[PDB]
Amino acid sequence: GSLTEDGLSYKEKFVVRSYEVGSNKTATVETIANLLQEVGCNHAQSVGFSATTTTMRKLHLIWVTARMHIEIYKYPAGDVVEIETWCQSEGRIGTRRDWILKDSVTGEVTGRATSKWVMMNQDTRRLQKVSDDVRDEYLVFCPQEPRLAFPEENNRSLKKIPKLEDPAQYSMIGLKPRRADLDMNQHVNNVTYIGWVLESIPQEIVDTHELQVITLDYRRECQQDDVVDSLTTTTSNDSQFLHLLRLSGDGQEINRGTTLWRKK
Amino acid sequence: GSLTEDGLSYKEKFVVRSYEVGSNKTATVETIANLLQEVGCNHAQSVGATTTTMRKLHLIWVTARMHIEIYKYPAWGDVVEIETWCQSEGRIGTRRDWILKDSVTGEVTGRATSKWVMMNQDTRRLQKVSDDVRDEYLVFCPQEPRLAFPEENNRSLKKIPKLEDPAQYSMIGLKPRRADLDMNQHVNNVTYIGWVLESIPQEIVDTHELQVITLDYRRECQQDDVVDSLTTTTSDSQFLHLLRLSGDGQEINRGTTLWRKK
Ligand SMILES: CNc1cnc2ccccc2n1
Ligand SMILES: CNc1cnc2ccccc2n1
């Protein structure tokens, strides 16, 4: 894995592992999400991060995921998959990180993703707009012209996700994160919330359909000692669902999103 | 990853990933277990893991016991090479051993061993190996005994007792998700390792490191099943573990772990 010739993006190849695939012998959506996350960690490291600047570490600010959008066309089965990631400023809202998944053999694009990141205070959990001086510190590592993965006029990543009404059609109650789900800072990995959202999708839908799109807004972080409830409702060959992750007790909303499924 | 010069073992190098480490910035025991499993999968593939006679008879290889000793956990970014190989254990079953080495210093940072038995995949019944299916796997095994844990009266061959109630520690309501299931829709054996350790307190994890883990697989956990994880200190620190179904209290696993100071 290394930065491209200009140094404004990063590339990395991955061989799909045995424990990374599902019932259809192809890489699960959580494995793909982990590979996108891994390539983004190494891009921050290659340009000198450990991804907070010296100014961000002084004021106690961190980058947090606010929205994640992942569209897959072909899930890699032993296959080699190369991912090209890059970041771009989104004015004073925050940052945007895009990915392009390509099959290393056929060279075709087998998927792509985009995420919106915001600047949150490490301790008070309070959000704030990216100040001018902090913004230009990472501008030197971003393409100046707009390079989006999803350039489409009314693209399916900038649409507002509604709140699921009760009763939910499907549900999966009592979901708790384990030590494997926690990261190096002891927080529940963002990829775990993707797997929790999909736990409410029926087994019949998973066995007769494949996941094409997944848009997910991160509202609140799930602490290790918290228990979640996953809810789903069909809103529609293609099938659409409305998802909502919320705490078991107080019913505190932690996530909301939508998924699109295509026939096999 | 490729077979060694003789073809009686397989080697593979791995770069530790960001999402594969814990709070100490070193690879979790479940990630190490996954790497050992992955290298064993490719060793079976590299030699062409059920034969035509086993497929015709409707038989499969199932893990009966797993023993893993780690001395140095590879940190995020480190390269770790694992050398795996199989050996016949007479008519009982098969034994697969691993040697984890640091690719920079060349030293051994860990080693593992597992006992596998021959079970009929449909009726779930353990069957005797028989001479003919045994000689099919002998052409891919070292003839002389090559054990990762060769010590007589070692930590991998001692009988694990059943945990008595009340358990000192516990973690109830553990359910496997779609990520925990494998290609055949079964809960992969690394999830049971993570479930065993869920009952270990946070104080023990934050002030100690996992050195040894011996685990006997008694019953498989179906996707629609809920487990209860129990732990009791028997002592370095030693614990006695027991995984059992929430409802009927059906035992699915039993094992022991040894923890060293940091
Ligand atoms: C107040 N806005 C947000 C946005 N995204 C989040 C993701 C995780 C945790 C808290 C979050 N808060
Ligand atoms: C009765 N012997 C055994 C040995 N190992 C097993 C592992 C998984 C499921 C059932 C098993 N049964």
Short mmCIF file of N, CA, C and O in Angstrom, two decimals, chain B residues 9-10 36 39-40 43 66-67 82-89 94-100 111-116 142 145-150 154 156:
data_model
loop_
_atom_site.label_atom_id
_atom_site.label_comp_id
_atom_site.label_asym_id
_atom_site.label_seq_id
_atom_site.Cartn_x
_atom_site.Cartn_y
_atom_site.Cartn_z
N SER B 9 4.57 -28.89 5.21
CA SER B 9 4.09 -27.76 6.01
C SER B 9 3.82 -26.53 5.13
O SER B 9 4.22 -26.51 3.96
N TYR B 10 3.14 -25.51 5.66
CA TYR B 10 2.79 -24.32 4.88
C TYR B 10 3.15 -23.06 5.64
O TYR B 10 2.94 -23.01 6.85
N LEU B 36 -4.38 -18.08 12.45
CA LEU B 36 -4.06 -19.51 12.52
C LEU B 36 -5.06 -20.31 11.68
O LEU B 36 -4.69 -21.29 11.03
N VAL B 39 -4.40 -19.61 7.80
CA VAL B 39 -3.22 -20.30 7.28
C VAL B 39 -3.49 -21.82 7.12
O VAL B 39 -3.01 -22.43 6.17
N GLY B 40 -4.33 -22.39 7.98
CA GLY B 40 -4.70 -23.80 7.88
C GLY B 40 -5.63 -24.09 6.71
O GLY B 40 -5.62 -25.18 6.16
N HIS B 43 -3.44 -24.16 3.59
CA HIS B 43 -2.59 -25.35 3.55
C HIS B 43 -3.39 -26.51 2.94
O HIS B 43 -2.85 -27.25 2.12
N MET B 66 -8.51 -26.92 21.34
CA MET B 66 -7.64 -25.88 20.80
C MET B 66 -6.75 -25.38 21.95
O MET B 66 -7.25 -25.13 23.04
N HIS B 67 -5.44 -25.28 21.72
CA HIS B 67 -4.52 -24.81 22.74
C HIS B 67 -3.66 -23.73 22.11
O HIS B 67 -3.02 -24.02 21.10
N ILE B 82 3.35 -17.45 10.03
CA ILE B 82 2.86 -18.64 10.71
C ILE B 82 3.17 -19.88 9.89
O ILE B 82 2.90 -19.92 8.69
N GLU B 83 3.74 -20.91 10.54
CA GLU B 83 4.02 -22.17 9.85
C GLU B 83 3.13 -23.28 10.41
O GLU B 83 3.28 -23.66 11.56
N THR B 84 2.22 -23.78 9.58
CA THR B 84 1.29 -24.82 10.01
C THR B 84 1.59 -26.18 9.35
O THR B 84 2.20 -26.24 8.28
N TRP B 85 1.18 -27.27 9.99
CA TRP B 85 1.35 -28.63 9.49
C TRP B 85 0.42 -29.58 10.23
O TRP B 85 0.07 -29.33 11.38
N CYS B 86 0.05 -30.68 9.59
CA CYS B 86 -0.81 -31.69 10.20
C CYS B 86 -0.06 -32.99 10.46
O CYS B 86 0.89 -33.31 9.76
N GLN B 87 -0.54 -33.76 11.44
CA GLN B 87 0.07 -35.05 11.73
C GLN B 87 -0.97 -36.01 12.28
O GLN B 87 -1.84 -35.60 13.06
N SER B 88 -0.91 -37.28 11.87
CA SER B 88 -1.87 -38.28 12.33
C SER B 88 -1.69 -38.57 13.80
O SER B 88 -0.56 -38.62 14.29
N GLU B 89 -2.80 -38.75 14.50
CA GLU B 89 -2.75 -39.11 15.91
C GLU B 89 -3.40 -40.47 16.05
O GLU B 89 -4.39 -40.63 16.76
N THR B 94 -6.76 -36.20 13.92
CA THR B 94 -5.63 -35.46 13.36
C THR B 94 -5.19 -34.34 14.33
O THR B 94 -5.98 -33.89 15.15
N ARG B 95 -3.93 -33.91 14.26
CA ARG B 95 -3.40 -32.85 15.09
C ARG B 95 -2.84 -31.77 14.16
O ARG B 95 -2.10 -32.12 13.25
N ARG B 96 -3.20 -30.50 14.36
CA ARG B 96 -2.63 -29.43 13.54
C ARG B 96 -1.87 -28.49 14.45
O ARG B 96 -2.45 -27.99 15.41
N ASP B 97 -0.58 -28.25 14.17
CA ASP B 97 0.22 -27.34 14.99
C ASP B 97 0.60 -26.06 14.24
O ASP B 97 0.69 -26.06 13.02
N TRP B 98 0.86 -24.98 14.98
CA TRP B 98 1.26 -23.70 14.41
C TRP B 98 2.44 -23.13 15.15
O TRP B 98 2.57 -23.34 16.36
N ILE B 99 3.27 -22.35 14.46
CA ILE B 99 4.39 -21.63 15.06
C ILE B 99 4.30 -20.19 14.54
O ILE B 99 4.39 -19.97 13.34
N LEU B 100 4.07 -19.23 15.43
CA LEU B 100 3.99 -17.83 15.06
C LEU B 100 5.34 -17.22 15.30
O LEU B 100 5.87 -17.34 16.39
N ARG B 111 2.76 -20.00 19.71
CA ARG B 111 2.56 -21.31 19.10
C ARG B 111 1.22 -21.91 19.52
O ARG B 111 0.73 -21.62 20.61
N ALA B 112 0.62 -22.73 18.66
CA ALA B 112 -0.69 -23.34 18.95
C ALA B 112 -0.75 -24.82 18.52
O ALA B 112 0.12 -25.29 17.78
N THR B 113 -1.75 -25.57 19.02
CA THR B 113 -1.98 -26.97 18.65
C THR B 113 -3.46 -27.28 18.81
O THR B 113 -4.09 -26.81 19.76
N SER B 114 -4.02 -28.07 17.89
CA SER B 114 -5.43 -28.43 17.96
C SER B 114 -5.65 -29.91 17.67
O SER B 114 -4.88 -30.52 16.94
N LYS B 115 -6.69 -30.50 18.27
CA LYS B 115 -7.02 -31.89 18.05
C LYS B 115 -8.32 -31.92 17.25
O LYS B 115 -9.29 -31.30 17.65
N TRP B 116 -8.32 -32.60 16.11
CA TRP B 116 -9.50 -32.66 15.25
C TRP B 116 -10.03 -34.08 15.19
O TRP B 116 -9.25 -35.02 15.13
N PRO B 142 4.42 -34.90 7.94
CA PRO B 142 5.77 -35.37 8.26
C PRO B 142 5.69 -36.74 8.95
O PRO B 142 4.81 -36.96 9.78
N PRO B 145 7.62 -37.53 14.33
CA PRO B 145 6.77 -36.62 15.11
C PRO B 145 7.36 -35.21 15.25
O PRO B 145 8.46 -35.03 15.77
N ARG B 146 6.62 -34.22 14.75
CA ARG B 146 7.02 -32.82 14.81
C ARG B 146 5.94 -32.04 15.55
O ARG B 146 4.98 -31.57 14.94
N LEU B 147 6.09 -31.93 16.86
CA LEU B 147 5.10 -31.25 17.69
C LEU B 147 5.52 -29.84 18.05
O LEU B 147 6.69 -29.60 18.34
N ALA B 148 4.55 -28.91 18.09
CA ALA B 148 4.83 -27.55 18.53
C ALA B 148 5.01 -27.54 20.07
O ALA B 148 5.83 -26.79 20.58
N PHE B 149 4.27 -28.40 20.78
CA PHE B 149 4.37 -28.55 22.23
C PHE B 149 4.78 -30.00 22.47
O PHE B 149 3.93 -30.87 22.61
N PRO B 150 6.09 -30.29 22.42
CA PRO B 150 6.53 -31.69 22.56
C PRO B 150 6.66 -32.20 24.00
O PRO B 150 6.66 -33.41 24.20
N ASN B 154 2.42 -31.89 29.30
CA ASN B 154 2.34 -30.45 29.00
C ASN B 154 0.93 -29.86 29.23
O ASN B 154 0.02 -30.56 29.68
N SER B 156 -1.32 -28.84 27.02
CA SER B 156 -2.33 -29.15 26.00
C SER B 156 -2.99 -30.53 26.12
O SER B 156 -3.88 -30.84 25.33
#
